[PDB]
Amino acid sequence: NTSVITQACPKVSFEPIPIHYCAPAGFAILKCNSKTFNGSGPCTNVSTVQ
Amino acid sequence: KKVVLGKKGDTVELTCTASQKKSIQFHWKNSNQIKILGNQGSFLTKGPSKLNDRADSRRSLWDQGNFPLIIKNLKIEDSDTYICEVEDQKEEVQLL
Amino acid sequence: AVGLGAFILGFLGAAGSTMGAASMALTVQARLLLSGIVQQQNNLLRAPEAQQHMLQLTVWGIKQLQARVLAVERYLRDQQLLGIWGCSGKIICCTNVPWNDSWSNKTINEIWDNMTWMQWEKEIDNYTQHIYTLLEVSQIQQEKNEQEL
Amino acid sequence: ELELTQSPATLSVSPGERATLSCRASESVSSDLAWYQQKPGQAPRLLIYGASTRATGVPARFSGSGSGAEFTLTISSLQSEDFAVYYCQQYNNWPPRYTFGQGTRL
Amino acid sequence: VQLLESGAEVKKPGSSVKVSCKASGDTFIRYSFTWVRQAPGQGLEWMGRIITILDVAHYAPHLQGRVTITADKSTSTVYLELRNLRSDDTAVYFCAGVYEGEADEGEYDNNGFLKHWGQGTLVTV
Amino acid sequence: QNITLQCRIKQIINMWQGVGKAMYAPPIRGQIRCSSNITGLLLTRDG
Ligand SMILES: *[C@@H]1O[C@H](CO)[C@@H](O[C@@H]2O[C@H](CO)[C@@H](O[C@@H]3O[C@H](CO)[C@@H](O)[C@H](O[C@H]4O[C@H](CO)[C@@H](O)[C@H](O)[C@@H]4O[C@H]4O[C@H](CO)[C@@H](O)[C@H](O)[C@@H]4O)[C@@H]3O)[C@H](O)[C@H]2NC(C)=O)[C@H](O)[C@H]1NC(C)=O
Ligand SMILES: *[C@@H]1O[C@H](CO)[C@@H](O[C@@H]2O[C@H](CO)[C@@H](O)[C@H](O)[C@H]2NC(C)=O)[C@H](O)[C@H]1NC(C)=O
Ligand SMILES: Cc1ccc(-c2ccc(NC(=O)N3CCC4(CCO4)CC3)cc2)cc1
Ligand SMILES: *[C@@H]1O[C@H](CO)[C@@H](O)[C@H](O)[C@H]1NC(C)=O
Ligand SMILES: *[C@@H]1O[C@H](CO)[C@@H](O)[C@H](O)[C@H]1NC(C)=O
Ligand SMILES: *[C@@H]1O[C@H](CO)[C@@H](O)[C@H](O)[C@H]1NC(C)=O
């Protein structure tokens, strides 16, 4: 079985904007600043951002 | 391993599963480690092999944790083994 | 960054330094501040100024304060929770539970001079609960004994 | 609801004349309209669709224009074979709630 | 495409009628279909619409509890089923449809016009 | 210069949101374009 719905289709403008994520109070985000980083393992230059 | 015998000239459904009961990334490969099928989240992809054609899955069961390999217009030459790549559960099945 | 509070942020820069260096660094900054040699600068938001643009600084104005207020509550909370081990009201609390060589068979010079806190708290992580239990027990026995005189 | 009506119940015209038919809707159409020619015993063949675009095979005689909820179909040089009942169809609802009007007779 | 109607039928109120329509001359799945009813003396009445690429259908407000439209993709046949049938439903029933450019490739245009028509099937009640 | 890719605008979309299909409204009349920056690729390799 399937479930099918329909909706009104006004067309809308669609142009993605940058969205950033921010730490809640009590937390912080560590960031890897290496020029070379393969996605895993130790990063030797780390900074903290919100 | 799990072995499934058909009538040679027909179709077979081999299955991989996950205990999560979620659609997760998975792949199917033959004994030479050549990709047959797999997904990319909601999308189905094909592997560039002798089974690139004549093959499909059941997208509707992916959210039940069921990730089948269905081979159509089956030949005896397809009676190899296959490896599941679901999580780390690298289970093996054989087609006959 | 922000979100941790001044207590943590003033110590966090020592994350890449050895344990010994971190203790010395804290001592020095305290000396300079007590003596009136250096001053602490603020990093707080200026508040909206223009009514039409105020969402930008009331959202972040409030969030910045929430982070600091919670940091204060956590600091003050821990300072009294530590009463259990007899360490309330302190940064450095020396106790009477002996160190076990089985937890870590190293000398204090090796630990304090060639390691950072990030490493130290990983090498002995599986003994943390053992030690904490012993700290409570020792405090109970001390209280028991003092009240018998 | 959606209903389409014609101005004439019947249209009194002679062959060779330019017949004029006029459809009015209870709801805005915004060019999503079509016209059909109904003869006794026949399917209501589509002649005009989309504002006034002629369907392939439709005589040049059939043309039209319109906007909003008021649309006009005309038949230049009307032939005797064109004395049909014409129907106006509006299909711009979504979910579909398409209707045909009462129609008019030539 | 040609649309082929089924045979005439006679029912009593409280029953139901299901009328087939065979579509041929092109690939079925690329055509959208509708049903239109015309009682004698009446104008055309839209009953409903079915999308064949996605099995989805809609019905006119008074038919929502009475009509089901099915597209049998394997036989290229569309069926109109009218339930809880009344004498008021005596009419000539018919199928119609229109081509959706490359609907198979996902270029379906939701075309609301009817170019291909059936002959009319008389159903009395 | 100017490698051209043949593109089509489609109405029936397989959702990335989960398994399922969806129909979108037909194309807008007018001129539509976008100029984008290619900043990375997704590549795969077989056995
Ligand atoms: C990567 O980033 C770049 C930016 O650096 C993105 O590029 C932008 O893409 C958008 C979307 O395509 C484009 O926006 C259009 O600009 C036009 C400028 O004239 C506008 O006219 C147009 O608005 C019309 O279309 C909208 C819907 O598509 C309607 O909602 C709106 O009401 C307008 O529609 C009316 O008018 C038109 C024109 O007469 C008519 O055809 C319609 O029928 C209707 O009457 C959009 O605003 C930006 O201009 C692009 N920016 C640049 C610098 O080129 C790129 O998309 C990003 N890449 C990815 C993959 O997301
Ligand atoms: C670690 O990363 C930081 C952030 O990129 C580097 O510091 C920046 O250096 C550039 C010059 O190349 C300056 O313009 C920026 O203002 C600096 N940013 C900050 C926050 O100081 C830093 O040099 C890197 N360190 C190492 C060892 O790689
Ligand atoms: C809300 C808030 C509360 C408290 C603090 C805070 C700031 C500095 C210290 N200083 C320190 O930890 N030192 C180490 C021990 C020593 C050497 C002999 O004594 C003195 C220096 C402690 C708490 C900040 C913000
Ligand atoms: C270390 O642990 C052992 C048990 O494994 C115990 O006998 C010994 O007394 C402990 N030493 C210290 C200093 O706690
Ligand atoms: C590529 O397009 C630009 C305009 O966008 C044009 O000036 C240039 O001559 C074109 N190059 C070729 C090889 O056609
Ligand atoms: C692409 O990069 C250039 C800088 O080289 C920048 O000016 C331009 O805005 C970028 N375009 C997009 C869509 O990000």
PDB file of C-alpha atoms in Angstrom, chain D residues 13-93:
ATOM      1  CA  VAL D  13     -26.452  32.571 -37.352  1.00  0.00           C
ATOM      2  CA  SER D  14     -26.420  31.816 -41.045  1.00  0.00           C
ATOM      3  CA  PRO D  15     -23.686  30.095 -43.084  1.00  0.00           C
ATOM      4  CA  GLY D  16     -20.998  32.535 -44.177  1.00  0.00           C
ATOM      5  CA  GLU D  17     -21.389  34.676 -41.051  1.00  0.00           C
ATOM      6  CA  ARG D  18     -18.883  34.984 -38.244  1.00  0.00           C
ATOM      7  CA  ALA D  19     -20.475  33.232 -35.296  1.00  0.00           C
ATOM      8  CA  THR D  20     -19.664  34.556 -31.842  1.00  0.00           C
ATOM      9  CA  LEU D  21     -19.846  32.401 -28.725  1.00  0.00           C
ATOM     10  CA  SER D  22     -19.160  33.720 -25.206  1.00  0.00           C
ATOM     11  CA  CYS D  23     -18.238  31.760 -22.008  1.00  0.00           C
ATOM     12  CA  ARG D  24     -18.314  33.139 -18.477  1.00  0.00           C
ATOM     13  CA  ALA D  25     -16.919  31.418 -15.406  1.00  0.00           C
ATOM     14  CA  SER D  26     -17.842  31.549 -11.713  1.00  0.00           C
ATOM     15  CA  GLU D  27     -14.075  31.290 -11.016  1.00  0.00           C
ATOM     16  CA  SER D  28     -11.069  32.854 -12.773  1.00  0.00           C
ATOM     17  CA  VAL D  29      -9.741  30.765 -15.678  1.00  0.00           C
ATOM     18  CA  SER D  30      -6.523  32.621 -16.482  1.00  0.00           C
ATOM     19  CA  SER D  31      -6.372  31.046 -19.987  1.00  0.00           C
ATOM     20  CA  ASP D  32      -6.830  27.469 -18.788  1.00  0.00           C
ATOM     21  CA  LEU D  33      -9.871  26.965 -20.969  1.00  0.00           C
ATOM     22  CA  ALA D  34     -10.854  24.762 -23.914  1.00  0.00           C
ATOM     23  CA  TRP D  35     -13.678  24.601 -26.471  1.00  0.00           C
ATOM     24  CA  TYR D  36     -15.365  21.526 -27.864  1.00  0.00           C
ATOM     25  CA  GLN D  37     -17.751  20.903 -30.790  1.00  0.00           C
ATOM     26  CA  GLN D  38     -20.630  18.494 -30.041  1.00  0.00           C
ATOM     27  CA  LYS D  39     -22.683  17.032 -32.858  1.00  0.00           C
ATOM     28  CA  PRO D  40     -25.492  14.468 -32.370  1.00  0.00           C
ATOM     29  CA  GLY D  41     -24.010  10.970 -32.220  1.00  0.00           C
ATOM     30  CA  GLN D  42     -20.455  12.357 -32.092  1.00  0.00           C
ATOM     31  CA  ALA D  43     -17.692  12.792 -29.573  1.00  0.00           C
ATOM     32  CA  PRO D  44     -17.296  16.443 -28.403  1.00  0.00           C
ATOM     33  CA  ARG D  45     -14.166  17.077 -30.487  1.00  0.00           C
ATOM     34  CA  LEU D  46     -11.586  19.546 -29.204  1.00  0.00           C
ATOM     35  CA  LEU D  47     -10.998  22.505 -31.397  1.00  0.00           C
ATOM     36  CA  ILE D  48      -9.471  25.119 -29.145  1.00  0.00           C
ATOM     37  CA  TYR D  49      -7.153  24.753 -26.195  1.00  0.00           C
ATOM     38  CA  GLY D  50      -5.124  27.146 -24.073  1.00  0.00           C
ATOM     39  CA  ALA D  51      -6.334  30.684 -24.457  1.00  0.00           C
ATOM     40  CA  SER D  52      -7.175  30.162 -28.130  1.00  0.00           C
ATOM     41  CA  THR D  53      -4.601  27.744 -29.641  1.00  0.00           C
ATOM     42  CA  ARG D  54      -5.961  25.624 -32.479  1.00  0.00           C
ATOM     43  CA  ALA D  55      -5.678  21.882 -32.160  1.00  0.00           C
ATOM     44  CA  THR D  56      -4.016  20.124 -35.040  1.00  0.00           C
ATOM     45  CA  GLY D  57      -6.585  19.537 -37.797  1.00  0.00           C
ATOM     46  CA  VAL D  58      -8.841  22.397 -36.695  1.00  0.00           C
ATOM     47  CA  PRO D  59     -10.164  24.671 -39.497  1.00  0.00           C
ATOM     48  CA  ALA D  60      -8.754  28.221 -39.601  1.00  0.00           C
ATOM     49  CA  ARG D  61     -12.309  29.381 -39.104  1.00  0.00           C
ATOM     50  CA  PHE D  62     -11.982  28.690 -35.384  1.00  0.00           C
ATOM     51  CA  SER D  63     -10.178  31.333 -33.342  1.00  0.00           C
ATOM     52  CA  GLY D  64     -10.588  33.331 -30.148  1.00  0.00           C
ATOM     53  CA  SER D  65      -9.315  35.323 -27.174  1.00  0.00           C
ATOM     54  CA  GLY D  66     -10.031  36.012 -23.505  1.00  0.00           C
ATOM     55  CA  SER D  67      -8.807  36.536 -19.953  1.00  0.00           C
ATOM     56  CA  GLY D  68      -9.954  36.459 -16.357  1.00  0.00           C
ATOM     57  CA  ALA D  69     -13.321  34.689 -16.348  1.00  0.00           C
ATOM     58  CA  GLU D  70     -14.630  35.906 -19.767  1.00  0.00           C
ATOM     59  CA  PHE D  71     -13.706  34.156 -23.034  1.00  0.00           C
ATOM     60  CA  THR D  72     -14.765  34.338 -26.671  1.00  0.00           C
ATOM     61  CA  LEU D  73     -14.819  31.811 -29.484  1.00  0.00           C
ATOM     62  CA  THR D  74     -15.579  32.856 -33.010  1.00  0.00           C
ATOM     63  CA  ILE D  75     -16.142  30.931 -36.200  1.00  0.00           C
ATOM     64  CA  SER D  76     -15.243  32.904 -39.329  1.00  0.00           C
ATOM     65  CA  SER D  77     -17.144  32.028 -42.491  1.00  0.00           C
ATOM     66  CA  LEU D  78     -19.371  29.580 -40.605  1.00  0.00           C
ATOM     67  CA  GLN D  79     -20.151  26.399 -42.500  1.00  0.00           C
ATOM     68  CA  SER D  80     -23.325  24.320 -42.278  1.00  0.00           C
ATOM     69  CA  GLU D  81     -21.292  21.500 -40.729  1.00  0.00           C
ATOM     70  CA  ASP D  82     -20.389  23.811 -37.818  1.00  0.00           C
ATOM     71  CA  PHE D  83     -23.955  24.076 -36.507  1.00  0.00           C
ATOM     72  CA  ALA D  84     -23.065  22.146 -33.361  1.00  0.00           C
ATOM     73  CA  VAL D  85     -23.502  22.596 -29.653  1.00  0.00           C
ATOM     74  CA  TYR D  86     -20.406  24.137 -28.258  1.00  0.00           C
ATOM     75  CA  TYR D  87     -19.023  23.508 -24.840  1.00  0.00           C
ATOM     76  CA  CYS D  88     -16.606  25.552 -22.713  1.00  0.00           C
ATOM     77  CA  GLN D  89     -14.254  23.685 -20.311  1.00  0.00           C
ATOM     78  CA  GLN D  90     -12.310  25.058 -17.358  1.00  0.00           C
ATOM     79  CA  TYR D  91      -9.519  22.994 -15.896  1.00  0.00           C
ATOM     80  CA  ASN D  92      -7.378  25.262 -13.701  1.00  0.00           C
ATOM     81  CA  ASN D  93      -8.286  23.806 -10.373  1.00  0.00           C
TER      82      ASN D  93
END
